[model samples]
Target: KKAIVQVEHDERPARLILNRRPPAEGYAWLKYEDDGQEFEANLADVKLVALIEG
Candidate 1:
């Protein structure tokens, strides 16, 4: 995937995080983590979800 990383006015060193299983025990989560982030009308909200990452 061609993911673009725009160089900001104050650029910082980026860390790459790889997702892994087995080592991760339980579900990951989300929140209203960013208000400035957005939503769409067609999008559906969810809860009681499960996830994992490495």
Candidate 2:
């Protein structure tokens, strides 16, 4: 699945969410693009919306 994420309520654009840790960990992993590197993000610091395409 892909996603649209907003960080700190002010960042722009979206990225692909690669994975997420358990809620207890409070973090998610994301990649900016297919060819981009993956990075870890804090769930409390972001608003992430997973997108579904048909």
Q: Pick the candidate with the highest lDDT.
A: 2
How much lDDT does each candidate structure score? 0.24, 0.52
- Write candidate 1's Cα lDDT for 1-54 as tens digits: 333222111132221122322233342222233232222211122222222332
Identify the runs in model 2 with alpha carbons over 4 angstroms from their true place. Answer: 1-12, 16-24
| Candidate 2 residue lDDT tens string, 1-54 | 444543332263345354555344767765654346666667676665555452
TM-score to true structure, per model: 0.16, 0.45
- Top TM-score: which candidate number? 2
lDDT of 1: 0.24
Poorest 10 consecutive residues of model 2 by lDDT? 5-14
RMSD (Cα, Å) for all candidates, in order, is 13.9, 4.7
